[PDB]
Structures are given as structure tokens and as C-alpha cells.
């Protein structure tokens, strides 16, 4: 009942991979490895998104995670904001932020 | 010119969320010029994008594709 | 009948349900994560295409994919990211 | 006979505008100007909705990171108040217009 | 004995000559000419590539690369852009 | 057997539209590539070698010079609100920049 | 004795510098500095001399360009003096740091 | 191999007069003190950043020698594309 990415040790579909990596005018020829790694790093980073989100879900006190938790999952965090830099998430809004200056008193 | 629909109100309300606490009156026009031109330099793209496909009718994808020519990259209308 | 059009949103459901069993994901927030995917799956195939032609080879492999995630990622995320990959092909070549 | 000084409602629009993600601009408008826009490029042409919203999505959150960069050149210029100099300045630096 | 490295150098002096006769290059400008060549085929070849693989092609044709020239080329350049590519395909095909 | 005809001959061309067509093939951008595509590209590629060549050429003789230098290629770029829209992101080496002190700066 | 006003070498040395193109740092120093920081990243490195050529030329370029953008920022706060806030903004915004 | 290759602290042959230069290239008139130390670092980071990848090609292609190449392809990564040292 193996499946090349439950060898992997993965949800993501080490198969479908291997094949975008073919049919997306990458290169020539594709290791075998590639696909496991690269679908391998893709889960991580899935992951790692859907833990804080998954929180700001649970802090805003929800059962689903709406694009906002993902907006400040990935903005609260030095460095997936800096991964996700020039990348505008539909419906996230921003972070809370009224400069210094501008308040009373 | 519907370009005079983006109201001076919707320009206060985006300034506000951009963190801006007094704007200038002259500014509603300048937002306005601005706004046009980044609608011209996307759609511009995105419908060179709907003439090459051979269709009449602008897809999300054709926008999208468009965005992520200007690096205004985005995610959550079929990236 | 429809198109046939292919994501990742199951994939995303299985990691969900692993870090978070008891919560769950409005469809824009999917299409969000599925253009994530997409956009990193791309960003380090490019980088990978890229070191290929660079060093005269025909073959995108495992290797590539690393020096490419080293590239791309930011340093802390970098580490994580190499440590999950290396241990993926560890872990397929020592199955079958 | 009640009044919130000037600026203490400002501050409380931030606040809200913030916390909120609906898009800001009205839809209708929005539209008609999109398709107003793409005339002069092809006659008779349609739009998906969806194409619509994303092309909305990304006026609203270019605009707003806009206007966060212009708030910027005002304080750098001991100011409080945005004004067309400031978003002039924020586009000249970030390569926009020349 | 030295292994060969392809240049554009050559194609630059020619239409040099044909543009201003009495003009020559130095070697570092020659260096910079070669750049901005091999620049500017990456991003056309690029968008035209992303072009097809967009609609489900796989055949990049002198079509891409027009469509991809329209949307990288500002203005009047991409006209002449056109037009000059334009009158060259139709001559190689007059021509056979 | 024909003799030889270049396809760059065939098209009116100066830049080599088969090696163009060759870099296409492997450079991993499509599994096929029409004859019409390498043609076109030489030519577009041809067509903003000439348009640089025209201005820096202009450029050299300005500063009474028979040979156009990186200066030269960067003033006329720069200058020119076209192309200098085409590179607004590539550093030309030994170029430097164009003259240009702010207003405000001048005295009195 | 013979003494030009404050700034109007400052003027005459921003003229003279954009007319030229040849490198301002010092060759060997920037050579050196290339090497002290490539040890950060891996120990006995040898360098293509044309590398450290591009690594210099790309540097003033790069540098050459803050400094515009801060000299804007300077004169858009009623200055004529840079200071290191006016860099800080320049950079912000072009979006170097956060 | 080992034998004296280790560096001192180059970052001063940064010059307060090289960093003036570079300001009036840049169209700079009058120049803060505090200047001269920002810029120092501003440049530090820029070459850790450049470098850092240009070496990240260097190390892919086995070499323990960094090329034009690698400057050039780390710069264009970084969207700083060079022309005039191949590419």
C-alpha cells in the first residue's frame, strides 16, 4: 500500500510533482529525488503557514481559517513576510498599525 | 469618467487603513491619477493576455497573469 | 463533465488536519494557499532550471532543488526547509 | 452639544479600516471604471466577475501601501498631514514614475 | 586551442556599420551590447514560453514572440518592434 | 544539392536567426519551436541593437569620438525615456550617470 | 588669501563626478573588504579578479542610487544636508528593510 | 591553503572621502557627520547579501573559485542586473 510519497514520508504528491517537473519546461531530464525534496519542502512551508493560521483561527475563536488568519500568520512573522514580500493575499487586510506620532498625548 | 465614481470618501477610507490621519483635499485628484494608471498598466496587460488566447471575454488568470508581470503578485484568484 | 482543472487542495486538507485535526478552511483561504504552493513550486523550479543551464547540465535533481531552496527561502525557514527535504529523499531511498 | 476634537475620529476610522479586510472602494463604480479602461484598449469586451474582484483586490492593497509610504514622507517632513508631494515622493523612490 | 565562446559581437559591428559607418565600439562597450542582447532574448523567450505553456501550447511560434514583445517593449520601440519582425517573417516566407 | 542560403539572408536579417533558433530549442522554453519564432526575435533583437547603436553612436560624436564606450551607451539610454523604461533595473558598468544637480542645491 | 564658500566645491566635486565614470573607492581596500566578508560564508576562496570588478562596479552603482533617493528625501524635509534618517526612509520604501 | 589567509577589519578602508564621492555622484551638496558610519553598513549588507548567493553558485558548481558568473547571476537574483561582465 506504499505510495512514492508515503515512502517519502508526505501528503504532498511526490507523482504529480515529478510529472510538473517534466511537462514545465524546467529542464531535460528530472532525478527522482527532486520531486520527494521539492514536494517535501512544499508540505513544509504548507504546513508551517497552517499552524499559525491555524492559531490566529483559534485566537479569533473559529473553526475555519479565513484569508485574515493567513494575513496575519504570514505578516506577523519576520520571515515568511519576507518570503511572501511582493505578494498580495485577497482579502487579508493589514496589520493593525497607527504611527507613533500621530496619537494623542 | 467614471474615473470621478472612486469618491473622495473611498480614498479616505483606504488612506485610513494605510495609517494616514489628515489628508490634503488635493489629494482625492492625485490618488485618482495614480489609481487610473495602475488600472491602465495591469489591464493593459491582462487583455493583451485575452487578445493572445483569442477571447473576448478577460478571465481572473488573464489579471493574475497581468499582476505578476507588474510584480504585483496575486494569491487567491487561480495563481 | 466540467474542465478536470487539478490543485492541491486535498493536500493542504491532509496537513491541516495533521497541525490543526479540529479546524478547517474557507474556499478563498484554500485558493490562497493553492496559489502559495504554486508560486514557491515555481519560484525554486525557476532557480533549479537556472543552476542547471548555468552549470551545462541536462538533469534538474534533488541537487538543485537544495541549492535553489538556499537561494529562495530565508535563512531560519532555509534550514527547516533543507532539514525536510534531505530527510524526505533519506527516508524514500531507504524504503524500496 | 458633543464633538470629537479633529483627528480623534480620524484615529478611530484607522482603527476600524484596519481590523476590517471588505474592499473599500464601492463595487459598481469600480466596475464601470475597469470597463471605461479596457475600451480604449478592445471594443465589446466582457469580464469575469471574479477577473473584476482580483483586478479590485490589487487597486485596494497597491493604493493602501501607497498611502503608507506617502503617511511616511509626511512625518519624515515634520508633518501630520499627506499631501501630493509625499505620494509624489514615495513613487519617485520606489521607481514608479521617473 | 582555447574552446569557443559565441558572442553577438559580430551582428553588433554589422548593424553598426549600417547605422552610423564611421563609428567603431570599444571592447567593453561591445561587452555591454552583448548583455543587453542576451538580456533582452531571456525576458522575450521567457514571456513567450510562459505565453504558451498559459494556453496549453507547446509550440512557441513567431506569434509569442510578438505577443511577448508587445507586453515587454514601451510604446513606439514595440511598434518598430513589430513591424520590423513583422516585414522579416514575411520575407523568409516569400522567400522560403 | 542547393548551395547554402542562411536563413538570416532569406529574412533580411543581420543577427543570426539560426543560431537563435538553436539557443530557443535548448535554452528550455518550449518542446517546439516554430520556424517563424527565431526569425521574428533575431529581428526584434536586431531592431534594438540598431536603436541603441543610432544614440550612442550620436552620443560618441558629441564628445568627439570615433568609438562608443559604455558612457556612451549609458547617456543615450538614459536620455532616451524608452529604452531607459527597458532598463530601468541593469547597471551598464562604466557608465556612470547623467549630469543632474537639484534645483535647490544651485546658489541663490 | 583666496577661500571658495561653503558648497561651492561641494557643487564643483558633484559636477566633476558625474561627468566621470571611473571607480571612486579605492581598488585594493574594496578587494579586501570582499574577502573578509566571503569568509562569513566559506574559508579559502579565490576570486576571478573581474568578479571583484562586478562585485565594485555593482556597489558604487547600487550606493550611487541611495544617495539620490536620500538627497531627495533630505530636500523633500526642507534640508540640504543628509542625514542618516533621510537613507533609513529612501530605504524603507524601497523596501531594503521594514 | 592555510598559511596567512585570515582578515583584519576592512569595512574602514571604506574611506570618509571615498563615501563623499560616491554622495556626489549621487547629486549629494551637504553631508551629516553620522553619514559616513550608516553608509558603511548599508554597503556591508549589500555585499553579504550579493556575495552570500554569488558563492551559493560557486559552491553548486564544486569550484573554490567565485567567477564574473556567479557576481552576475547573484546580482540578478537580487534584481541588480549588471551588464558588461558576461550574461
Same mark, same amino acid.
Given at each position: 500500500?506504499?505510495?512514492?510519497?508515503?515512502?517519502?514520508?508526505?501528503?504532498?504528491?511526490?507523482?504529480?510533482?515529478?510529472?510538473?517537473?517534466?511537462?514545465?519546461?524546467?529542464?531535460?531530464?528530472?532525478?527522482?529525488?527532486?520531486?520527494?525534496?521539492?514536494?517535501?519542502?512544499?508540505?513544509?512551508?504548507?504546513?508551517?503557514?497552517?499552524?499559525?493560521?491555524?492559531?490566529?483561527?483559534?485566537?479569533?475563536?473559529?473553526?475555519?481559517?479565513?484569508?485574515?488568519?493567513?494575513?496575519?500568520?504570514?505578516?506577523?512573522?519576520?520571515?515568511?513576510?519576507?518570503?511572501?514580500?511582493?505578494?498580495?493575499?485577497?482579502?487579508?487586510?493589514?496589520?493593525?498599525?497607527?504611527?507613533?506620532?500621530?496619537?494623542?498625548? | 469618467?467614471?474615473?470621478?465614481?472612486?469618491?473622495?470618501?473611498?480614498?479616505?477610507?483606504? !488612506?485610513? /487603513?494605510?495609517? +494616514?490621519?489628515?489628508?490634503?483635499?488635493?489629494?482625492?485628484?492625485?490618488?485618482? %491619477?495614480?489609481?487610473?494608471?495602475?488600472?491602465?498598466?495591469?489591464?493593459?496587460?491582462?487583455?493583451?493576455?485575452?487578445?493572445? !488566447?483569442? /477571447?473576448?471575454? +478577460?478571465?481572473?488568470?488573464?489579471?493574475?497573469?497581468?499582476?505578476?508581470?507588474? %510584480?504585483?503578485?496575486?494569491?487567491?484568484?487561480?495563481? | 463533465?466540467?474542465?478536470?482543472?487539478?490543485?492541491?487542495?486535498?493536500?493542504?486538507?491532509?496537513?491541516?488536519?495533521?497541525?490543526?485535526?479540529?479546524?478547517?478552511?474557507?474556499?478563498?483561504?484554500?485558493?490562497?494557499?493553492?496559489?502559495?504552493?504554486?508560486?514557491?513550486?515555481?519560484?525554486?523550479?525557476?532557480?533549479?532550471?537556472?543552476?542547471?543551464?548555468?552549470?551545462?547540465?541536462?538533469?534538474?535533481?534533488?541537487?538543485?532543488?537544495?541549492?535553489?531552496?538556499?537561494?529562495?527561502?530565508?535563512?531560519?525557514?532555509?534550514?527547516?526547509?533543507?532539514?525536510?527535504?534531505?530527510?524526505?529523499?533519506?527516508?524514500?531511498?531507504?524504503?524500496? | 452639544?458633543?464633538?470629537?476634537?479633529?483627528?480623534?475620529?480620524?484615529?478611530?476610522?484607522?482603527?476600524?479600516?484596519?481590523?476590517?479586510?471588505?474592499?473599500?472602494?464601492?463595487?459598481?463604480?469600480?466596475?464601470?471604471?475597469?470597463?471605461?479602461?479596457?475600451?480604449?484598449?478592445?471594443?465589446?469586451?466582457?469580464?469575469?466577475?471574479?477577473?473584476?474582484?482580483?483586478?479590485?483586490?490589487?487597486?485596494?492593497?497597491?493604493?493602501?501601501?501607497?498611502?503608507?509610504?506617502?503617511?511616511?514622507?509626511?512625518?519624515?517632513?515634520?508633518?501630520?498631514?499627506?499631501?501630493?508631494?509625499?505620494?509624489?515622493?514615495?513613487?519617485?523612490?520606489?521607481?514608479?514614475?521617473?
Amino acid at each position: 500500500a506504499k505510495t512514492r510519497s508515503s515512502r517519502a514520508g508526505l501528503q504532498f504528491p511526490v507523482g504529480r510533482v515529478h510529472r510538473l517537473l517534466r511537462k514545465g519546461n524546467y529542464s531535460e531530464r528530472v532525478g527522482a529525488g527532486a520531486p520527494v525534496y521539492l514536494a517535501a519542502v512544499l508540505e513544509y512551508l504548507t504546513a508551517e503557514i497552517l499552524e499559525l493560521a491555524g492559531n490566529a483561527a483559534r485566537d479569533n475563536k473559529k473553526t475555519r481559517i479565513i484569508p485574515r488568519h493567513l494575513q496575519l500568520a504570514i505578516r506577523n512573522d519576520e520571515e515568511l513576510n519576507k518570503l511572501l514580500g511582493r505578494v498580495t493575499i485577497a482579502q487579508g487586510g493589514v496589520l493593525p498599525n497607527i504611527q507613533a506620532v500621530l496619537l494623542p498625548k | 469618467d467614471n474615473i470621478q465614481g472612486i469618491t473622495k470618501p473611498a480614498i479616505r477610507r483606504l !488612506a485610513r /487603513r494605510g495609517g +494616514v490621519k489628515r489628508i490634503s483635499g488635493l489629494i482625492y485628484e492625485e490618488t485618482r %491619477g495614480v489609481l487610473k494608471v495602475f488600472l491602465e498598466n495591469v489591464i493593459r496587460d491582462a487583455v493583451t493576455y485575452t487578445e493572445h !488566447a483569442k /477571447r473576448k471575454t +478577460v478571465t481572473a488568470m488573464d489579471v493574475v497573469y497581468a499582476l505578476k508581470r507588474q %510584480g504585483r503578485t496575486l494569491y487567491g484568484f487561480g495563481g | 463533465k466540467r474542465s478536470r482543472k487539478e490543485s492541491y487542495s486535498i493536500y493542504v486538507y491532509k496537513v491541516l488536519k495533521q497541525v490543526h485535526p479540529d479546524t478547517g478552511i474557507s474556499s478563498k483561504a484554500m485558493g490562497i494557499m493553492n496559489s502559495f504552493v504554486n508560486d514557491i513550486f515555481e519560484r525554486i523550479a525557476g532557480e533549479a532550471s537556472r543552476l542547471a543551464h548555468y552549470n551545462k547540465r541536462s538533469t534538474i535533481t534533488s541537487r538543485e532543488i537544495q541549492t535553489a531552496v538556499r537561494l529562495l527561502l530565508p535563512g531560519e525557514l532555509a534550514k527547516h526547509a533543507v532539514s525536510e527535504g534531505t530527510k524526505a529523499v533519506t527516508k524514500y531511498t531507504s524504503a524500496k | 452639544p458633543h464633538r470629537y476634537r479633529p483627528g480623534t475620529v480620524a484615529l478611530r476610522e484607522i482603527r476600524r479600516y484596519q481590523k476590517s479586510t471588505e474592499l473599500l472602494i464601492r463595487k459598481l463604480p469600480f466596475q464601470r471604471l475597469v470597463r471605461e479602461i479596457a475600451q480604449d484598449f478592445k471594443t465589446d469586451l466582457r469580464f469575469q466577475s471574479s477577473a473584476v474582484m482580483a483586478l479590485q483586490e490589487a487597486c485596494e492593497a497597491y493604493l493602501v501601501g501607497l498611502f503608507e509610504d506617502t503617511n511616511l514622507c509626511a512625518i519624515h517632513a515634520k508633518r501630520v498631514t499627506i499631501m501630493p508631494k509625499d505620494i509624489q515622493l514615495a513613487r519617485r523612490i520606489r521607481g514608479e514614475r521617473a
